[PDB]
Amino acid sequence: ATGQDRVVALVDMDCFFVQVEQRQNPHLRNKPCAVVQYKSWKGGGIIAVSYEARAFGVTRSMWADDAKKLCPDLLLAQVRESRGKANLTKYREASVEVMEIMSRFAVIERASIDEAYVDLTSAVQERLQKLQGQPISADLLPSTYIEGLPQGPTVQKEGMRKQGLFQWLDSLQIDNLTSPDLQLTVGAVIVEEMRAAIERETGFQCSAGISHNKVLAKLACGLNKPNRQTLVSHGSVPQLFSQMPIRKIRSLGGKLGASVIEILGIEYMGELTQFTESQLQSHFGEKNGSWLYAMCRGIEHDPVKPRQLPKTIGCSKNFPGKTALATREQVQWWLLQLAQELEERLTKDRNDNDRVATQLVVSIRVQGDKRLSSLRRCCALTRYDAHKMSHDAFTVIKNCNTSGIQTEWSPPLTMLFLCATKFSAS
DNA sequence: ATTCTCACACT
DNA sequence: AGTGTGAG
């Protein structure tokens, strides 16, 4: 098994929220700019950064006040606020624009508001029979980089790309309709076309990775951003992984990746090949060990899920610092604010996508606790009604109130969370 | 006060 | 059901 059965792409909308604001406000185009939320504390938290601003060092999670110190001409657009919380509807709606276009070309799995995996295997097959057996021109791949090329016996970026692509296409074996390299290349032609259609029909630019699975496709996508696409072939994996830090591979950016590094005493993905599968399973469990043994040879089997819609709809807000909720009627009021936004989105979801959610999940965070959530409770969701929803949410959390007073809430709450789950066809 | 989401494994 | 990890 060489993990070359599929053609999979990962498409990533370049700094998506910024692009949405730049389409809407021409003044912001081709300028260093960022999208922020909650203007009051330190000028707002930055949640998306244009490439012009990233060259000054502006990143996500900065405060806008701090970003302006790195980039004094930074322009800002602020997220819509509804009922005291950031409202992402404009970006969600723009996402649906893009996903609907992508769905014309192949079946897609929505990964987040601005990424989608694409399964191109069948689309490639049909495009290879329509193509008689004729060469693929470099003109069909005007923004494609071939990872690892050029090599062997130019000083500008576009010169290198064309040389890499020339060497790739020159050695391509077009007469064999089953070569995985040829299948990737056709896959890349289809993604150029999909990316052309997205930009024509929305104005949005994006990057893409093309490879044989989601993990390599995702890694590839990040190699030549913005507005470019990268093909990572099976043959390119040993050189690519030989200096690729473990933490860059999807699902290894956290504790598991750190302990792969610490327990095995290695730094790069390719060093994993020297261990037997049993060795890896004993250190990291059957599932992780098998997965690691295959992944470091470029092999991964997670399917592109034919799923363009989320499985839960949730509304959370944080109350950090002295803003932690400390009274009963504070908790009730914010639960109602979250329940009302939830109600808006559930009804819109029942009209568009013909489904009703049946379970309500409530999560709270307590001041002093260490973790994302302190506590998770559920109850039935039988009516899309904000006052019943918030009333029910309070009911299943009210006994977490350590305080003996009826009107006070101790310990103060640093996070409220409502989530609709367990959908049924409607 | 990276916030705000969403998916999945484990038990 | 409830907790913990990982991601965009």
Ligand SMILES: O=c1[nH]cnc2c1ncn2[C@@H]1O[C@H](COP(=O)(O)OP(=O)(O)OP(=O)(O)O)[C@@H](O)[C@H]1O
């Ligand atoms: O903490 C986060 N880390 C990454 N992402 C986050 C985070 N919190 C929320 N998000 C959501 O994930 C969208 C795109 O996150 P992304 O990583 O794909 O990066 P961008 O499009 O900003 O620019 P790129 O770097 O892709 O050119 C963001 O806007 C927002 O909706």
Ligand SMILES: [Ca+2]
């Ligand atoms: Ca993106």
